[PDB]
Amino acid sequence: SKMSDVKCTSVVLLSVLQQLRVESSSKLWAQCVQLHNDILLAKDTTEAFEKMVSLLSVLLSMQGAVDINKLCEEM
Amino acid sequence: DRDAAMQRKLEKMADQAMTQMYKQARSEDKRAKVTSAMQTMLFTMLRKLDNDALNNIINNARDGCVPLNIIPLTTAAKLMVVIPDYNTYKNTCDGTTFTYASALWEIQQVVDADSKIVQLSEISMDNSPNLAWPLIVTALRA
Amino acid sequence: DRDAAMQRKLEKMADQAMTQMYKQARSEDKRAKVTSAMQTMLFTMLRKLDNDALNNIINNARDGCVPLNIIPLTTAAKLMVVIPDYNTYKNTCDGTTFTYASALWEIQQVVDADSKIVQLSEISMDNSPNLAWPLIVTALRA
Amino acid sequence: WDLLKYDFTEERLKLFDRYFKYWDQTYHPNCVNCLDDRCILHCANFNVLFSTVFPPTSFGPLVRKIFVDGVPFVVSTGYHFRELGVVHNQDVNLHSSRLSFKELLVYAADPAMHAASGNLLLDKRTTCFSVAALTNNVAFQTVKPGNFNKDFYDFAVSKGFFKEGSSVELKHFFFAQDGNAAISDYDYYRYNLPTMCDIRQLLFVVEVVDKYFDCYDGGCINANQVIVNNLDKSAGFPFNKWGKARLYYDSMSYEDQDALFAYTKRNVIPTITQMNLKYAISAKNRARTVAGVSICSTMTNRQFHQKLLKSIAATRGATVVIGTSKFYGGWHNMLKTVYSDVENPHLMGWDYPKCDRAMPNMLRIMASLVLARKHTTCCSLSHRFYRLANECAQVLSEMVMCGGSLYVKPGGTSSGDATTAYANSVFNICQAVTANVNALLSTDGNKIADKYVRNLQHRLYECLYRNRDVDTDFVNEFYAYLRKHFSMMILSDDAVVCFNSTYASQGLVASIKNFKSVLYYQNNVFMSEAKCWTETDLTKGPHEFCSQHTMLVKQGDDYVYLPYPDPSRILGAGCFVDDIVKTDGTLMIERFVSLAIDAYPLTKHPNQEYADVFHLYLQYIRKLHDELTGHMLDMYSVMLTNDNTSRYWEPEFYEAMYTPHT
Amino acid sequence: AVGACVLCNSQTSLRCGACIRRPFLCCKCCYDHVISTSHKLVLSVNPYVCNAPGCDVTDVTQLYLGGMSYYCKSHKPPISFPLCANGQVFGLYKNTCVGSDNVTDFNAIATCDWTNAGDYILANTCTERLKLFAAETLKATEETFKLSYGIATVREVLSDRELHLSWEVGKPRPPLNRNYVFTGYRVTKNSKVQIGEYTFEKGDYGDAVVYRGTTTYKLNVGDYFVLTSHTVMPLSAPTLVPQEHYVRITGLYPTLNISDEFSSNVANYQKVGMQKYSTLQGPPGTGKSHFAIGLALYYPSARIVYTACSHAAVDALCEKALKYLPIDKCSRIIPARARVECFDKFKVNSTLEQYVFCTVNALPETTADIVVFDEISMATNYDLSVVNARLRAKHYVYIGDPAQLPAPRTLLTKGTLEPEYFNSVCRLMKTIGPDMFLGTCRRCPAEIVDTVSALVYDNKLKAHKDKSAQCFKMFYKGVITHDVSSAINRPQIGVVREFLTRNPAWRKAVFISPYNSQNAVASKILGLPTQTVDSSQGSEYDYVIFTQTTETAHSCNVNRFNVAITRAKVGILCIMSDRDLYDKLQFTSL
Ligand SMILES: Nc1ncnc2c1ncn2[C@@H]1O[C@H](COP(=O)(O)OP(=O)(O)O)[C@@H](O)[C@H]1O
Ligand SMILES: [Mg+2]
Ligand SMILES: [Zn+2]
Ligand SMILES: [Zn+2]
Ligand SMILES: [Zn+2]
Ligand SMILES: [Zn+2]
């Protein structure tokens, strides 16, 4: 049941990117929206992950916006 | 019965003051704690997916090895990732191969913080302290 | 008991009518505010009118009726061209001066999507992808 | 051409005397000279051809410089419609002193001030004519993604949904949009074209459509009888900056609200309409735009049309089924008033591709005429014509404010005025009858063995082309023919047709292919046969009407039709919520109750994975209430006193919701 | 309004309203607090008072809930529930309030009036939430004590700038210095409007007040000035962020071969890069502030906020940065008021710069890299909470010395504070030892550092300098004035003005006497640049003239004398009053 988990996680990820105020950088927001739309309209599992990676590396690319060190520490 | 009807009216008013207060307090708590609950939910789901590339980029991003642009997917496309420590360099760079996002990339250009190009020969454990270390590796997808 | 019931209904009626009076006072106080704001907007838009060329073309008209679609086209001092990509920008406003609507315009400013000013020398074919697209180019009449 | 030449009457008459020289009927270019509501379709249709040879910068409002207490304004005193020609006002307040609220509203709504006091825009993103740019920077608007209801998703994967290979899956999501959505959707008005509809055929399809609209009644109503359904909605471009529609419905008394309506029966009010992006769950990524019409147009369209728009939405058992509730055994009554004793039924459904953008201007004028034929007594003729011009300047060809810039909308109905669904219903019935007329004429004639039908075709041709005035005997006979062999059901473009099979096979009634041809030469689009369905049976109902499939269940003792939604849209509405406070769940039980009501008929579906959705919503409402009383027993110290949520998790309530009693 | 208990961090909606700071309390904790102390007023979402209009009973031990309101026993409804019952007090989240046994410390903190040393040592050995609450209520008590000062009504207007005042008898007169402000009032039987904010200074001669006003209104006889109080806002951030050692340096990028003088500090720079926060303790003039400068140089890719408790301390930090650090990334933020003279050489009020210098109270809410707090001894737990709430950062350095003089703590009058209870960081320094430690004076010559190693510092200093023969002593008494309880010694000022010529190299010397009134007096008679001892401690001067005014408990504290003398770069002349203090150091006799 892992296909319909990537679709929702992309919605959460784009919500996080929007809350980080990435709407300002229009070149970045166009790519994030395109990745989100192509994740949701994806009927194949591997392509969904290969686009989820590109979407996530937008979130990781912001040094002083999120705190990945604390967030992953709860594992 | 007049007394009991008045008391019942007061009890119903107390219930209407219970529910409205509850679903105002919960509403303001949910709407005032959205910037962090969303992120914690996202990383809970990211642990739940249990993929390879997602774990690879997250585990590298804990150790300061973030990418400076969106990871491309097309063959022979460019990616500039910072490597901030020699320990974060020993794990990903093997020869001219660069393991990232569960894919192999070819290293093109390694530039230190002073932006001057440094070849792969100069990256040695003895010579590691002698560089302004937060390297940017510009690589291409293989 | 008859007196008490009549008094209670009287107080209910009086506090219903005072509620209505509060509502009508608020309504008539909002109407005046909206009227003042509308008159302010109309007189400011009057102040922005270019009363020389516009008056010239109106006094040049048949009955003083000019179609609205040519009121900007012959009198607007500012021209905001919006360009989606470099291929159009080459063919619509190349250089610092271009001709549109049979009058000569000179570039005054070029901004990108997120409103960060871009100098005209950066709009090159090789430098096209790095720009934030559609470019609002603001020009003035000459 | 001279940029200031708006009165193009002489060139139009020269064209008409060069090309259509021996055309019998007269032709008065300015349609304000016309005689009734069937010399307006004629002259309007002629103009919609003759106005593709004149420059496109000389249409729209006609401004003029007036003086208000010694200060010079520029205001719109007319219009030059492409279809209706030149229209001048009759109340031009040159040299006014004081502006009341009505005059202030009129001079704030119309775009003469806004376009005159703006910078000239040259937008290469679109192909529509771009009139002006009000601000100094074009504003880009995005659509943020929906918020996730994670508790419901974990509860859904707990009950076994969302597997690999399941027949119920998440397809309806909250798609996001980049900066260039709002202007790359308005660009779809390039699909509109100036189309000259046939003019001896429209003047008979108007008769048949009007016969379809003969039961209802209406007319001009006063200000104090107008019923506003909802008041906290925005009020177009120049008015949203100060308050919602409540402010303009409260600030104006009834006297200066009837004064406005009696002012637009003798003037023309051009009107900006804003275009916003809707934020709602949808199955495909194209951005959806809704056109907010300014309160200066709604406040009169409601008053002019409300009696008819309430008589249509309160009459049950007719062709335009708008206002027949699908609950309470209302769907079965619809589906039994479709099968109005036709011979060998087959159900047919079509779908107009780009219906609200590619609809030709002539059919919008046709809809606004047949929807305004009821005013035979309340208002005069010129009043009806200025109401038609105001509808065609505030709906059809208006100034669209699309992200901080006034463009000109070339045509096609906006989806936000007062008469939208009903105007689309009239247009839809017009296309259905036009397909029928084409199918009946275009038959070989010698193969039509049924000797009554051949005589009907031989009279149909005569009433179409060889007869100038109405023929009410034949129109009545043909409309009885249509309701005998082409029984129809309309919800604004969602149609179901119960056409006799033998007649369609012989060609004496409109099959699908006739609708493809009619949409080709009248709607200017191509309705590919992969999106218009045909059901050859009746024990399974229409395939898809109003986006709710139909199935035949056994209730009580007898068989009734039940409407069930696409059982993925319900899950999509559960898992995704457009506002973050709706994620909390325990606040929203009165939302899952509504979803369960809408999704109850999935219980009786023969498939099981469909049937489990209703039990998912029931168990989820029960768990939501359990955790709600848990939190209201921890937070306070006492349980709720009169708790009445013990029926929302019982299927008897939802089953009562689909029973024929109330 | 719900929240977390300040004793056990449970969800609750009670607030013990008798406390000045009004803290949240869980139900069990609220019962244990109102059962013991005289706190007999509990605020729920609406106050617990007898809602019958003809009653005033507020104690929660006897109030009964009825209908939807609360009543005493006299107005008790037929159906009523006692609030104070079975070990709890009725309130929200009643079933999930986990009790705590730490109610004794909370009672003692919220009950005591911050006068004896027991209250302060109770305010530094408690838990984190109790630390924050104690610091906040101490600040509130200081503000309320400030509110109890007299009202200054003028008698006549001497000049456009000089005013003659009279304070209302029955309340003590506040001392005249630049910190205290007043709001003026004009009573003309109506229209009591704030006529301006005025700061007062004692005049050169006579009972005169020189006023500086925001407004330019002419003063009349009827105008009176009232002291203004600042509403102390609550704090949330912990006093110390939890330490988390790192295996390797994160958030920093070291630079090879920064300089030669910073050679011995490289290991400590790496240690600061390692830990989340670190502490540096050293004797005065041992490079502690200059260590932070070399730390800034060693990690040039780090947006560093230097912050300090004092004003001239952060100004001296700015001066040292301008001496070493490159100038065009440093900014010096001053407040909107800024009634004291700041340091104007950097781009003033530039938050966006890389090397941002600020006072604690003027810090802007920002993210940052490694942030250096200077002179931790001068700061209390309120300051540490403020700096940890406004600046979110990846590395914290706390530099300062416990041996120096602490924060004033005007409320404290009986007993003396041990050093280790100054604040959380000084307790960290004196419990487990400093994370970095460097003692050798690079500031003062040999004789002064030898004396200070015979003083409070048990002999450990090994300063790298020789006896410059520029250290001088005096013994004569002088006369006391007791102006506003800030004494001034006119004959000592006269003798300093007399000296002043026989050794012309001391004409650039800097005047040191704590005694802010005498510090202002010194600006007139001899005109030397002057500085009080408290606004000192972080700057240094080549020649220092130190004047001990009175043999009181204030200007004879060994810490204050040590921190006054150890600013002498090359030389100091100290004119002493106490026979024992003068004899305890070895300068020339004179
Ligand atoms: N290694 C060194 N080389 C040269 N001078 C030094 C060295 N270490 C310290 N100093 C001098 O000692 C002084 C100590 O200053 P500072 O750190 O402000 O003392 P404190 O921390 O007591 O205020 C500095 O002004 C600096 O010039
Ligand atoms: Mg120092
Ligand atoms: Zn009418
Ligand atoms: Zn208390
Ligand atoms: Zn507690
Ligand atoms: Zn009482």
Author numbering:
A (entry chain C): 1 to 75
B (entry chain D), C (entry chain B): 50 to 191
D (entry chain A): 268 to 929
E (entry chain E): 1 to 590
Reported in the publication:
The SARS-CoV-2 genome is replicated and transcribed by its RNA-dependent RNA polymerase holoenzyme [holo-RdRp, subunit composition nsp7/nsp82/nsp12 (3, 4)] in a replication–transcription complex (RTC), which is the target for antivirals such as remdesivir (Rdv). Translocation of each enzyme opposes each other, and if the helicase prevails it is expected to push the RdRp backward on the t-RNA. This reversible backward sliding, termed backtracking, is a well-studied feature of the cellular DNA-dependent RNA polymerases (DdRps).
Therefore, to determine the structural organization of the SARS-CoV-2 BTC, we assembled nsp13(ADP-AlF3) and holo-RdRp with the BTC5 scaffold (hereafter called BTC5) and analyzed the samples by single-particle cryo-EM. The sample comprised two major classes: nsp131-BTC5 (3.4-Å nominal resolution) and nsp132-BTC5 (3.6 Å). Analysis of the two refined structures revealed that the RdRp portion of each structure was essentially identical (rmsd of 927 nsp12 α-carbon positions <0.3 Å), while the disposition of the common nsp13 protomer (nsp13.1) was divergent (rmsd of 590 nsp13 α-carbon positions >8 Å). In the nsp131-BTC5 and nsp132-BTC5 cryo-EM maps, the single-stranded 5′ segment of the t-RNA was engaged with nsp13.1. The five-nucleotide segment connecting the t-RNA between the helicase and the RdRp (+7 to +3) was disordered and not modeled. We used molecular dynamics simulations to explore the fate of a mismatched nucleotide incorporated at the p-RNA 3′ end. Starting with the nsp132-BTC5 structure, the −1C was mutated to U, and the +2 to +4 Cs were removed. The resulting pretranslocated p-RNA had a matched −1U and a mismatched +1C (−1U + 1C).
